[model samples]
Target: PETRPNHTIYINNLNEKIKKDELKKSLHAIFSRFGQILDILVSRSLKMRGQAWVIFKEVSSATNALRSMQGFPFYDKPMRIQYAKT
Candidate 1:
Protein backbone atom coordinates (compact mmCIF):
# COMPACT_ATOMS: atom_id res chain seq x y z
CA PRO A 1 0.00 0.00 0.00
CA GLU A 2 1.20 3.47 -0.84
CA THR A 3 1.78 5.51 2.25
CA ARG A 4 -0.23 8.66 2.67
CA PRO A 5 1.04 12.03 3.84
CA ASN A 6 0.37 13.57 7.25
CA HIS A 7 -1.77 16.49 6.20
CA THR A 8 -4.40 15.59 8.76
CA ILE A 9 -5.01 17.70 11.86
CA TYR A 10 -6.26 16.49 15.24
CA ILE A 11 -9.07 18.56 16.65
CA ASN A 12 -10.72 18.08 20.01
CA ASN A 13 -12.26 20.03 22.86
CA LEU A 14 -15.43 19.95 20.85
CA ASN A 15 -18.91 20.30 22.27
CA GLU A 16 -20.22 16.91 23.36
CA LYS A 17 -23.60 17.62 21.85
CA ILE A 18 -22.20 18.22 18.39
CA LYS A 19 -22.92 15.56 15.81
CA LYS A 20 -21.01 14.66 12.62
CA ASP A 21 -22.85 16.86 10.14
CA GLU A 22 -23.06 19.79 12.50
CA LEU A 23 -19.39 19.67 13.38
CA LYS A 24 -18.48 19.25 9.73
CA LYS A 25 -20.50 22.29 8.80
CA SER A 26 -18.98 24.30 11.61
CA LEU A 27 -15.37 23.46 10.73
CA HIS A 28 -16.05 23.82 7.03
CA ALA A 29 -17.44 27.26 7.64
CA ILE A 30 -14.20 28.14 9.41
CA PHE A 31 -11.36 26.01 8.00
CA SER A 32 -12.59 26.21 4.42
CA ARG A 33 -12.03 29.94 4.57
CA PHE A 34 -8.33 29.13 4.72
CA GLY A 35 -8.34 26.50 1.93
CA GLN A 36 -9.89 23.40 0.47
CA ILE A 37 -10.59 20.45 2.76
CA LEU A 38 -9.98 16.94 1.55
CA ASP A 39 -11.95 15.47 4.43
CA ILE A 40 -13.20 16.11 7.94
CA LEU A 41 -13.53 13.12 10.28
CA VAL A 42 -15.70 13.31 13.39
CA SER A 43 -16.48 10.18 15.37
CA ARG A 44 -19.92 9.39 16.77
CA SER A 45 -18.53 6.79 19.20
CA LEU A 46 -16.07 6.90 22.10
CA LYS A 47 -13.35 5.81 19.69
CA MET A 48 -12.31 9.44 19.87
CA ARG A 49 -15.10 11.17 21.64
CA GLY A 50 -15.53 14.85 21.00
CA GLN A 51 -12.62 14.79 18.57
CA ALA A 52 -12.09 15.23 14.85
CA TRP A 53 -9.49 15.15 12.09
CA VAL A 54 -9.47 17.62 9.23
CA ILE A 55 -7.38 16.85 6.20
CA PHE A 56 -6.40 19.49 3.69
CA LYS A 57 -5.46 18.89 0.10
CA GLU A 58 -2.53 21.22 0.52
CA VAL A 59 -0.19 21.06 3.49
CA SER A 60 0.29 24.82 3.45
CA SER A 61 -3.45 25.34 3.89
CA ALA A 62 -3.44 22.93 6.83
CA THR A 63 -0.62 24.85 8.48
CA ASN A 64 -2.34 28.16 7.95
CA ALA A 65 -5.67 26.92 9.24
CA LEU A 66 -4.07 25.37 12.32
CA ARG A 67 -2.35 28.64 13.19
CA SER A 68 -5.51 30.64 12.70
CA MET A 69 -7.68 28.20 14.61
CA GLN A 70 -5.46 27.32 17.58
CA GLY A 71 -7.49 29.45 19.94
CA PHE A 72 -10.62 29.33 17.82
CA PRO A 73 -14.01 28.56 19.27
CA PHE A 74 -16.60 26.01 18.29
CA TYR A 75 -20.02 26.06 19.94
CA ASP A 76 -18.46 28.49 22.41
CA LYS A 77 -15.62 26.06 23.22
CA PRO A 78 -12.03 26.41 22.18
CA MET A 79 -11.14 23.69 19.70
CA ARG A 80 -7.81 21.87 19.94
CA ILE A 81 -5.88 21.47 16.72
CA GLN A 82 -2.57 19.80 15.81
CA TYR A 83 -0.91 17.31 13.50
CA ALA A 84 -1.80 13.68 14.03
CA LYS A 85 0.98 11.43 15.44
CA THR A 86 -0.07 8.54 13.29
Candidate 2:
Protein backbone atom coordinates (compact mmCIF):
# COMPACT_ATOMS: atom_id res chain seq x y z
CA PRO A 1 0.00 0.00 0.00
CA GLU A 2 1.06 3.61 -0.51
CA THR A 3 -0.26 7.14 -0.56
CA ARG A 4 -1.66 6.43 -4.00
CA PRO A 5 -2.57 3.25 -5.84
CA ASN A 6 -2.04 3.03 -9.58
CA HIS A 7 -2.16 -0.60 -10.59
CA THR A 8 -5.60 -1.77 -9.66
CA ILE A 9 -9.16 -0.63 -10.28
CA TYR A 10 -12.10 -1.39 -8.02
CA ILE A 11 -15.25 -2.05 -10.01
CA ASN A 12 -18.71 -2.05 -8.53
CA ASN A 13 -22.35 -1.25 -9.25
CA LEU A 14 -22.48 -4.08 -11.70
CA ASN A 15 -25.28 -6.21 -13.01
CA GLU A 16 -26.07 -8.88 -10.44
CA LYS A 17 -26.68 -11.38 -13.23
CA ILE A 18 -23.12 -11.16 -14.49
CA LYS A 19 -21.40 -14.47 -13.88
CA LYS A 20 -17.81 -14.47 -12.66
CA ASP A 21 -16.53 -16.23 -15.75
CA GLU A 22 -18.39 -13.91 -18.06
CA LEU A 23 -17.23 -10.89 -16.14
CA LYS A 24 -13.63 -12.02 -16.31
CA LYS A 25 -13.83 -12.69 -20.00
CA SER A 26 -15.57 -9.43 -20.73
CA LEU A 27 -12.99 -7.51 -18.76
CA HIS A 28 -10.14 -9.27 -20.49
CA ALA A 29 -11.64 -8.55 -23.86
CA ILE A 30 -11.95 -4.86 -23.09
CA PHE A 31 -9.06 -3.97 -20.79
CA SER A 32 -6.54 -6.18 -22.54
CA ARG A 33 -6.98 -3.98 -25.55
CA PHE A 34 -4.86 -1.40 -23.73
CA GLY A 35 -2.09 -3.42 -22.04
CA GLN A 36 -1.10 -6.54 -20.14
CA ILE A 37 -3.17 -7.84 -17.29
CA LEU A 38 -1.73 -9.39 -14.18
CA ASP A 39 -4.96 -10.74 -12.67
CA ILE A 40 -8.65 -10.20 -12.19
CA LEU A 41 -10.55 -10.95 -8.98
CA VAL A 42 -14.32 -11.23 -9.14
CA SER A 43 -16.84 -11.97 -6.40
CA ARG A 44 -19.27 -14.71 -7.32
CA SER A 45 -21.30 -14.99 -4.16
CA LEU A 46 -24.72 -13.44 -4.03
CA LYS A 47 -23.75 -11.66 -0.82
CA MET A 48 -20.76 -10.14 -2.56
CA ARG A 49 -22.47 -9.37 -5.84
CA GLY A 50 -21.61 -6.46 -8.08
CA GLN A 51 -17.96 -6.25 -7.12
CA ALA A 52 -14.69 -7.05 -8.85
CA TRP A 53 -11.04 -6.01 -8.90
CA VAL A 54 -8.80 -5.74 -11.94
CA ILE A 55 -5.05 -5.68 -11.61
CA PHE A 56 -2.80 -4.63 -14.43
CA LYS A 57 0.86 -5.21 -15.02
CA GLU A 58 1.42 -1.47 -15.15
CA VAL A 59 -0.14 1.68 -13.82
CA SER A 60 -0.71 3.06 -17.30
CA SER A 61 -2.72 -0.01 -18.19
CA ALA A 62 -4.94 0.52 -15.17
CA THR A 63 -5.38 4.16 -16.05
CA ASN A 64 -6.41 3.22 -19.54
CA ALA A 65 -9.07 0.85 -18.30
CA LEU A 66 -10.53 3.24 -15.78
CA ARG A 67 -10.49 6.09 -18.24
CA SER A 68 -12.50 4.22 -20.83
CA MET A 69 -14.54 1.70 -18.89
CA GLN A 70 -16.04 4.04 -16.40
CA GLY A 71 -19.78 4.30 -17.05
CA PHE A 72 -19.56 1.66 -19.75
CA PRO A 73 -22.66 -0.48 -19.90
CA PHE A 74 -22.66 -4.24 -19.75
CA TYR A 75 -25.69 -6.38 -19.11
CA ASP A 76 -27.66 -3.14 -19.08
CA LYS A 77 -25.80 -1.78 -16.05
CA PRO A 78 -23.23 0.98 -16.14
CA MET A 79 -19.95 0.03 -14.48
CA ARG A 80 -18.28 2.05 -11.75
CA ILE A 81 -14.53 2.07 -12.19
CA GLN A 82 -12.16 3.70 -9.74
CA TYR A 83 -8.75 3.25 -8.16
CA ALA A 84 -8.44 0.87 -5.23
CA LYS A 85 -7.41 2.17 -1.80
CA THR A 86 -4.23 0.21 -1.88
Top candidate on lDDT is: 2
TM-scores for all candidates?
0.85, 0.86
Off by over 4 Å in 2: 1-5
Task: Check candidate 1 and list the clashing pairs.
Answer: none
| lDDT value for model 1 | 0.79
* lDDT of model 1 at position 59: 76
Model 1 alpha-carbon miss at residue 44, Å: 0.8
TM-score of 1: 0.85
lDDT of 2 by residue, 1-86 (tens): 32254988888988877788998898888788868889889888877789888889899888888888889987888898888883
Model 2, residue 74: what's the lDDT? 78
